[PDB]
A paper describes a structure:
The [name] motor of the eukaryotic replicative helicase is loaded as a double hexamer onto DNA by the Origin Recognition Complex ([name]), Cdc6, and [name]. [name] is a ring-shaped helicase containing six related AAA+ ATPase polypeptides featuring bipartite active sites with catalytic residues contributed by neighbouring subunits.
To further understand the role of ATP hydrolysis in [name]-to-SH transition, we assembled a DH loading reaction using [name]-[name] bearing the Mcm5RA variant. While all [name] subunits are visible, the two states differ in the configuration of [name]. In conformer 1, solved to 3.7 Å resolution both the C-terminal WHD domain of [name] can be observed as well as the ATPase domain (though local resolution of the latter is lower). [name] ATPase is engaged in AAA+ interaction with the neighbouring [name] subunit, with ATP bound at the interface. In turn, for OC1MMcm5RA we observe two states, co-existing after Cdc6 release. In one state, the full [name] subunit is visible, and its ATPase domain is flexible yet still engaged to the neighbouring [name] subunit. Compared to the OCCMMcm2RA, which contains a three-subunit ATPase spiral, the [name] subunit engages [name] in OC1MMcm5RA, capping the N-terminal end of a four-subunit spiral. [name] establishes new contacts with DNA downstream of the [name] DNA binding sites and away from [name].
Author numbering:
A (entry chain 2): 183 to 458, 475 to 709, 739 to 864
B (entry chain 5): 23 to 106, 133 to 193, 204 to 213, 236 to 303, 320 to 335, 349 to 517
C (entry chain 6): 100 to 123, 134 to 200, 260 to 420, 445 to 463, 500 to 509
D (entry chain 8): 15 to 158, 186 to 207, 220 to 433
The structure:
């Protein structure tokens, strides 16, 4: 038959299960696999099948749009009963593969087809009962990963009252199947699984958590159990961000009907395909922006527009947002690619609300308070698995912020042990742990932005930095940029700040309507920033994703002499622990400056601005009597 | 049909000749003289002797290994009768080992080869190997060699039989925990553990922290919807190319070898030649000596980096952890005495308390890298005193006390 | 064979259908709105329910709500078939009723066994919450001896297998195969609340209670919120009654313990000039 | 990428099976150990360091000469054909370029003949390229962001196989051989080719080979190969075509918009079908909700104007009623929500409408605009 499956006599399951309809759609699927219209590209699926047989793998990726275009209702059936369609489509793929490479079943039992580019995406919080048993595509962050264990797939039973063997039953991962009548005895006697004639499968369970920047206000993070089957194991590890496509099914049957009041179950997602990306229209506008002369100043002015002044802090914030190059030189050596910033100053200097801009600007940001954090909580926590009862580990805030930024407010007032827990994370970008027999190291590739208050609550300008804070030289050495702020009084500066703040409070006050309100919002953004903020976010993401400037030794002296000058001026004064780690800060911040221009090379101008920032940061932290001398000692730079 | 398999095993034992000697017959005779009822069969000789029985064993050993046991027992009894219990099969092999992470639902009931480190061992358990039973209703007796008692009498009601304890035999069994080498585990992953079981002469041969090579059968047992716990029937445990030997001997013959290796330690760092050479000495390590009173001299070299921050002190340890063949890296803050050293924990798979090794136990025979050492607690330091100076770890938890060695 | 009928329930259903047909037809507009926007639950103002037959209908419905609810559900589904049959379509007649705007609000202090099976409204500060789950509202089973199917097996507060095979040619009992496709489910959530500060006098400790929410009303309760609930009190089995003094009744041996929980259908959180001003006389 | 080595495969009986096997599966292959490669390296060095292009030559309607481009990039292009009927009088002015061209041609003519014998089943065209009948285009970029291009020749030859993308090619010691549109067209389905991406500022010289351009594209068509090359150059170089071929440029450009609107309709069908099957009711959703998903499927930004362009061609496509919110909506017009046969029928109806409108536009005597005007929904 053909086109006769379009008749809607009843719900889709009542029609698909009919053997004639199944044969018709299997023939249609075979036609789709054998021939597809990709013009100059020929039938790409044939080449895919041939190369899969060549590569000895089971993954036949199928573009949803292709099948939808070629066969209208054939894709819609998969969109509402994915399991039933895949059940026969696996056999169709298997025979198609055996056409090119015979005896494929001699090694591979089945073909695990994977769906790609499914056009409907739901969050982990948007799932509803109306989408039960349907195909869904969700995006989340891997938090906890269980082991890989075998699980039954086709089960046969042995009757106790006869030597006959019961027929095969498919394990849907829904319930521990227990038959009630023997096919020969018709008795309700005991049954036992015939293991020697039973086919298994691999099983793994992974929890997907809401992305750190996507948690709604005032609610705990949502998460679901995701089941990885059919060689889909080890596709992700804790800290990774993935998007997965699967089936929304219910399998928590058992004592829950009596332990908790009334009969209830719990939902899981059984994963079909998983994936761990820019259109031309976005790259064109990015490249239009990149060619503007002096783009660096616009970017710097774009950070936290409503905060007046503090340009020497805004530049550091922007540089940390863009970051540098994590040069894993020759593999055997590594350098952290991210810039660490400390905001130290008097109260009433917005050392905290800047972090409330990094949290809203960076792709993935984690915020914590000094006394509201624990060493176990930040790094990693130990858990016992509810299924396997084994010791398991769950990542903390630093593991969550992997390939992101971690924020710690009131960094000075946290207890010493929680502060010590940050030592390894600040340089190794990793968490090393040994608890309950678990020995492992997680990736913690994140930058740290810290805000703190000086000893006594007010900065003593007459005393060095190494005396105004309760911190120590080790901890200070893990930073790159130190921003010291004085709340000194002056009529002109105070008038400027007040007239900026009052207009900021006038702006932020409330007062195709969607388009009109977006236009008005962008008008207000233009009134205060040179770059639209959504474009800035996309630009930052694109720069972090694509641009990796390289270095040249054209200006070796200009950096070496600056390093020597700083070391000489730090020889006998209480000041920053200037070391090789601080030398690397110049290079990394120069790389960050270059990455704003999207240039592939580190230029002399970038190094000039880098040297300016580092030298100014070092100088502005010395005592008053020496500051006015070092002002003139470094007049060259 | 299986009589041919038994005959083939009999030929492979009695008549197989290597190095102009009946090596298998002679070794089985020597074991009988020693009264060790076990035979160490080498798979590399078995494949060379007969390929068909090797194919059967590789594909369906389920009936082959009972045949192995009974044939070896019969042949050994014949040899004992000629010269004047069930003999255990031990397999030695050198074929390629499948990685532990690659074990899947396809290798069910197949004999595989593995390598790893032992992290925990259970206490011995007594299992039945031959039983004689009597019916309580009519005193009828019979013998039985998973096994379960008959439901009806052979002469009485359901379940009439009881076990005659004074006319039965039992054997020992031990449960083992294997995991992959942490050096082969990429960061961001906890090494996979694996349950193994051994019986009779294969028990008590390893302790936690031991690195072994395994020949065994991949199988599952019931203890999640259908998550059947996998376990390994242990069959044989074992614990450089000639051109590589020549290359490394020439490297030793290099007149500038010491300086070359000194520069080779973290070449991407400048100077620090003294600490570089000290770390080289740590990597080589000292030589063990034993006093005539039985005490052992600790040959490990322990070095404390106690300088100003930012002097590449962490980078050196992170580089050594790459270089040393056995290396463990952990922070002082994120570790504990129960984690750094051994601990006693209950195994949920066998419902028994297990002695489990710690991080420093895993680093036995290697080097451990620890950072922020000043920030660990004093109890951990006290345990590390024993680990450093006596190469032992003393455990006194719950109601059990034990001492475990650690050459870290 | 004719089953026993509740004539009072039939009168209540008829009065409820007449109320739906005659009230002004804002509720029929609500039904159409649900059809347009694909909505599962209809909402009824209690003061609208209490303005027909001098509110005697509302009183009768409230005081035995757990009994009369099926009749109102039948009336509403008959009405929706009369006017919006497309809501019976799936891809199969899941439908909920939620009453709101109760006149009286009762404290956790004033919980009594007399209130069981009656409509009432309570308020309390939320302290702990559990994640949402699916609940088996109505299940269906297929026979094991033969292959007959049994639909509309309502699971009243317990896992309930069918008591017989409908065809007399089969002798199946105590064994069934559960369907997970033709069966339908609903959302489930439990809210653990605390007595408010202004209720407890000085020197008195606050009372705690567990509240049950189902359907789309879930997740509208947040910790620290002075939420308000509307529904009926229901008792649930309890295991902590063991060891208490006094004679305990027995069934014949079986146990018959109980503890009290509140089931709420409507959720609201207590908290723009004209919006506030239009709510005042 | 397959590699051909003259030290082991240099004979016709050796090359022909290898070339046929490569072309039955690939469109690009490499040449190794060619004797002139050592001289080719020195000639390339001389061109890129001493023999700079003659920037004063200018550019003509024949797409030959030294065309200035954006970012001060210069393009030196020459065309040669054995048939005198085409006036390619602008021969190459530089002797080093001719030295590279001759050394390329000496083996490239034989390789093109081998490819034609391998994949072209037409016995009348087995020797369509030879010393007596051949046409070549010499191309040289110069600098005083990859560009996608598709040669129309039988074979394309590059003296250096570096920085070329399709995955990148990094084989400097091998020459790159790429098949064009004509060879695949005459292959009768036995061989296909794909466009390449190259750096326009890399100063790379390239050669492409055709039979004499007066040869028709096929016996089934009236236009010649020169017409196809002219179409390709007009599409590639609008600035040059403006002086000489404006109307042809507009006609050629409108086809891209036609394909765009067709694929937009194809995407919208799937989007609306999935929206309809995800609801128990047929209420039309607001357009602004559908737009992100539509743009994601299209893999480029889609706006309301592009949607309204569809209504211009096929009025019976969708129902576009405006919601009480003031937000535009769209829905399927069919009462019984969908049928695959009716879906194909509606797609074919839109295709027919688009083709008829394209023919109407190109038949007009007025100058053609290259974009479909947008429909206006009646304001309420
Ligand atoms: N430089 C500034 N420009 C504008 N507003 C500022 C500035 N510094 C502080 N403020 C205002 O003062 C408040 C400071 O908040 P907070 O960041 O907690 O101060 P700090 O962290 O410095 O103690 C902010 O709400 C901000 O509006
Ligand atoms: N001699 C050196 N050569 C190269 N890099 C060095 C040298 N000394 C220090 N460094 C730099 O210092 C960093 C290591 O600092 P580290 O020892 O981790 O700080 P801390 O002592 O606070 O742990 C590395 O990034 C490395 O590049
Ligand atoms: Zn039976
Ligand atoms: Zn008996
Ligand atoms: Zn029945």
């Amino acid at each position: 038959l053909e086109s006769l499956s379009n008749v809607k006599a009843n719900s889709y399951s009542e029609w698909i299960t009919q053997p004639n309809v199944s044969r018709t759609i299997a023939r249609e699927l075979k036609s789709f696999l054998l021939e597809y219209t990709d013009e100059t590209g020929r039938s790409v699926y044939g080449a895919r099948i041939r190369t899969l047989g060549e590569m000895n793998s089971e993954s036949l990726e199928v573009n949803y749009r292709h099948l939808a275009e070629s066969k209208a209702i054939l894709a819609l059936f998969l969109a509402k009963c994915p399991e039933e369609m895949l059940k026969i489509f696996d056999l169709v793929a298997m025979e198609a593969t055996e056409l090119h490479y015979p005896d494929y079943a001699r090694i591979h039992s089945e073909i695990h087809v994977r769906i790609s580019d499914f056009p409907t995406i739901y969050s982990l919080r948007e799932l509803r009962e109306s989408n039960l048993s349907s195909l869904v595509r969700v995006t989340g962050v891997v938090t906890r990963r269980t082991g890989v264990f075998p699980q039954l797939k086709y089960v046969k039973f042995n009757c106790l009252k006869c030597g006959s063997i019961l027929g095969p039953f498919f394990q849907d991962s829904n319930e521990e199947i227990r038959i009630s009548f023997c096919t020969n005895c018709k008795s309700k006697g005991p049954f036992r699984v015939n293991g020697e004639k039973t086919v298994y499968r691999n099983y793994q369970r992974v929890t997907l958590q809401e992305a750190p920047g996507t948690v709604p206000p005032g609610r705990l993070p949502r998460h679901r159990e995701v089941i990885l089957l059919a060689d889909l194991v080890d596709v992700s590890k804790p800290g990774e961000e993935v998007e997965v496509t699967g089936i929304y099914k219910n399998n928590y049957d058992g004592n829950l009907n009596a332990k908790n009041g009334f009969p209830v179950f719990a939902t899981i997602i059984e994963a079909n395909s998983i994936k761990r990306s820019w259109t031309e229209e976005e790259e064109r506008e990015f490249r239009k922006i990149s060619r503007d002369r002096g783009i660096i100043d616009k970017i710097i002015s774009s950070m936290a527009p409503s905060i007046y002044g503090h340009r020497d802090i805004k530049t550091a914030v922007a540089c940390s947002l863009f970051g540098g190059v994590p040069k894993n030189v020759n593999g055997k050596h590594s350098i952290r690619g991210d810039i660490n910033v400390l905001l130290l100053g008097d109260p009433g200097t917005a050392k905290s609300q800047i972090l409330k801009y990094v949290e809203k600007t960076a792709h993935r940001a984690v915020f914590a308070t000094g006394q509201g954090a624990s060493a176990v909580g930040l790094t990693a926590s130990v858990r016992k698995d509810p299924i396997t009862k084994e010791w398991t580990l769950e990542g903390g805030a630093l593991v969550l912020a992997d390939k992101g930024v971690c924020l710690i407010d009131e960094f000075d007032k946290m207890n010493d042990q929680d502060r010590t827990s940050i030592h390894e994370a600040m340089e190794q970008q990793s968490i090393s742990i040994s608890k309950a027999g678990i020995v492992t190291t997680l990736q913690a590739r994140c930058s740290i932005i810290a805000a703190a208050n000086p000893n006594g609550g007010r900065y003593n300008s007459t005393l060095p930095l190494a005396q105004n804070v309760s911190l120590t030289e080790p901890i200070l050495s893990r930073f790159d940029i130190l921003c010291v702020v004085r709340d000194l009084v002056d009529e002109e500066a105070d008038e400027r700040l007040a007239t900026f703040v009052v207009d900021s409070h006038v702006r932020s006050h409330p007062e195709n309507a969607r388009q009109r309100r977006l236009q008005r919002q962008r008008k207000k953004e233009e009134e205060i920033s040179p770059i639209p903020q959504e474009l800035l976010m996309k630009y930052i993401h694109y720069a972090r994703t694509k641009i990796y400037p390289k270095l040249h030794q054209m200006d070796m002296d200009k950096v070496s002499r600056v390093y020597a000058d700083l070391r000489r001026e730090s020889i006998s004064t209480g000041s920053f622990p200037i070391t090789v780690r601080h030398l690397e800060s110049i290079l990394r911040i120069a790389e960050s400056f270059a990455k704003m221009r999207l240039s592939e090379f580190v230029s002399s101008y970038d190094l000039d601005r880098a040297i300016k920032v580092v030298v100014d940061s070092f100088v502005d932290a010395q005592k008053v009597s020496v500051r006015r001398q070092l002002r003139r000692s470094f007049a060259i730079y | 049909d299986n009589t041919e398999i038994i005959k083939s095993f009999k030929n492979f034992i009695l008549e197989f000749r290597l190095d102009s000697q009946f090596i298998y017959r002679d070794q089985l005779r020597n074991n009988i003289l020693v009264k060790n009822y076990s035979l160490t069969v080498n798979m590399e000789h078995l494949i060379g002797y007969n390929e068909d029985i090797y194919k059967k064993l590789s594909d369906e050993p389920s009936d082959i290994i009972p045949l192995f046991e009974t044939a070896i027992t019969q042949v050994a009894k014949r040899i004992s009768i000629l010269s004047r219990p069930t003999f255990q099969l031990i397999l030695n092999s050198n074929a390629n080992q499948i990685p532990l992470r690659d074990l899947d639902s396809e290798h069910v009931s197949k004999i595989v080869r593995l390598s790893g480190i032992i992290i925990s061992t259970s206490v011995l358990s007594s299992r039945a190997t031959y039983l004689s039973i009597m019916c309580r209703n009519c005193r009828h007796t019979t013998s039985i060699t998973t096994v379960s008692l008959p439901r009806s009498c052979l002469s009485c009601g359901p379940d009439p039989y009881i076990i005659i304890h004074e006319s039965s035999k039992f054997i020992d069994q031990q449960f083992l925990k294997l995991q992959e080498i942490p050096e082969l585990v990429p960061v961001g992953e906890m090494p996979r553990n694996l349950t193994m079981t051994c019986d009779r002469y294969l028990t008590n041969k390893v302790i936690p922290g031991t690195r072994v090579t395994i020949v065994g059968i991949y199988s599952i047992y019931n203890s999640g919807v259908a998550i059947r716990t996998p376990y390994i029937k242990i069959l044989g445990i074992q614990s450089f190319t000639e051109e590589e030997e020549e290359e490394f001997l020439q490297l030793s013959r290099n007149p500038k070898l010491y300086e070359i290796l000194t520069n080779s330690i973290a070449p991407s760092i400048f100077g620090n030649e003294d600490i570089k050479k000290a770390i080289v000495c740590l990597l080589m390590g000292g030589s063990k000596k034993i006093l005539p009173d039985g005490m052992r001299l600790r040959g490990d070299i322990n070095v404390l980096l106690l300088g100003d921050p930012g002097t590449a002190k962490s980078q050196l340890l992170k580089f050594v952890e790459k270089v040393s063949p056995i290396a463990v890296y952990t922070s002082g803050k994120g570790s504990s005495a129960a984690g750094l050293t051994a601990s006693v924990q209950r195994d949920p798979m066998t419902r028994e308390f297990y002695l489990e090794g710690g991080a420093m136990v895993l680093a036995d025979g290697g080097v451990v890298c620890i950072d922020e050492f000043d920030k660990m607690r004093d109890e951990d330091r006290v345990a590390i005193h024993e680990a450093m100076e006596q190469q032992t770890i003393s455990i006194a938890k719950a109601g059990i006390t034990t001492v475990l060695n650690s050459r870290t | 064979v004719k089953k026993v009928d509740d004539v009072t329930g039939e009168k209540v259903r008829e009065a409820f259908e007449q109320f739906l047909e005659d009230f002004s037809k804002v509720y029929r507009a609500q039904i159409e709105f649900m059809k347009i926007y694909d909505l599962n639950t209809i909402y009824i103002d209690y003061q609208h329910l209490s303005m027909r037959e001098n509110g005697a209908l509302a009183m009768a419905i409230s005081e035995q709500y757990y009994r009369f609810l099926p009749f109102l559900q039948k009336g509403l589904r008959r009405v929706v078939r009369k006017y919006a049959p497309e809501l019976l379509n799936t891809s199969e007649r899941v439908f909920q009723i939620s009453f709101f705007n109760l006149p009286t609000v009762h404290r956790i202090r004033d919980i009594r066994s007399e209130k069981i099976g009656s409509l009432l409204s309570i308020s309390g500060t939320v302290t702990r919450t559990s994640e949402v789950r699916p609940e088996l509202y109505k299940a269906s089973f297929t026979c094991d001896m033969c292959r007959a199917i049994v639909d509309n097996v309502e699971q009243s507060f317990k896992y309930t297998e069918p008591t017989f095979c409908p065809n007399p040619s089969c002798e199946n009992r105590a064994f069934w195969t559960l369907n997970v496709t033709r069966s339908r489910f609903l959302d489930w959530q439990k809210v653990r609340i605390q007595e408010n500060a202004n209720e407890i006098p000085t020197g008195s400790m606050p009372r705690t209670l567990d509240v049950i929410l189902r359907g789309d009303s879930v997740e509208r309760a947040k910790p620290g919120d002075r939420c308000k609930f509307t529904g009926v009190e229901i008792v649930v089995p309890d295991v902590t009654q063991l060891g208490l003094p006094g004679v305990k009744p027995s069934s014949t041996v079986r146990d018959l313990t109980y503890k009290i929980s509140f089931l709420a259908c409507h959720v609201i959180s207590i908290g723009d000039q004209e919006v506030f001003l239009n709510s005042l006389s | 990428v397959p590699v051909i080595d003259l030290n082991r495969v240099s004979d016709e009986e050796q090359l022909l099976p290898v070339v046929r096997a490569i072309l039955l599966q690939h469109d690009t292959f490499l040449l190794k150990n060619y004797a002139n490669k050592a001289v080719l390296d020195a000639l390339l060095a001389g061109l890129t360091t001493k023999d700079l292009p003659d920037t004063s030559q200018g550019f003509d309607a024949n797409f030959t000469g030294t065309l200035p481009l954006e970012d001060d990039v210069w393009l030196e292009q020459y065309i040669f054909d054995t048939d005198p009927q085409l006036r390619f009088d602008r021969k190459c002015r530089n002797e080093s370029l001719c030295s590279i061209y001759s050394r390329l041609f000496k083996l490239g003519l034989f390789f093109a003949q081998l490819c034609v014998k391998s994949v072209v089943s037409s016995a009348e065209l087995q020797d369509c390229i030879s010393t007596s009948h051949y046409a070549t285009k010499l191309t040289r970029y110069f600098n005083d962001d990859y560009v996608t291009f598709l040669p129309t020749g039988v074979l394309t030859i590059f003296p250096c196989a570096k920085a070329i993308r399709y995955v990148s090619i990094d084989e400097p010691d091998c020459l790159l051989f790429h098949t064009g549109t004509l060879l695949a067209r005459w292959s009768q389905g036995m061989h296909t080719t794909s466009p390449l991406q190259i750096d326009p500022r890399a100063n790379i010289v390239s050669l492409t080979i055709w039979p004499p351009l007066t040869t028709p594209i096929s016996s089934k068509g009236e236009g010649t190969i020169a017409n196809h090359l002219l179409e390709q150059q007009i599409k590639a170089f609008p600035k040059v075509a403006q002086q000489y071929y404006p109307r042809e440029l507009s006609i050629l450009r409108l086809q891209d918009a036609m394909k765009f609107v067709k694929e937009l309709f194809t995407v919208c069908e799937t989007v609306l079908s999935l929206n309809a099957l995800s609801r128990s009711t047929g209420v039309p959703p607001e357009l602004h909700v559908l737009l992100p998903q539509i743009s994601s499927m299209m893999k480029r930004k889609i706006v309301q104007d592009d949607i309204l362009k569809l209504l211009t061609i096929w009025s019976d496509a969708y129902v576009v009623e405006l919601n009480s919110r003031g937000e535009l909506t769209m829905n399927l017009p069919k009462r019984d929500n969908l049928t695959t046969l009716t879906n194909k029928s509606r797609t074919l109806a839109f295709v027919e409408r688009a083709e008829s409108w394209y023919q109407q536009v190109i038949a007009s005597k007025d100058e053609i605009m290259t974009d479909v005007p947008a429909f206006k929904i009646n304001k309420r």
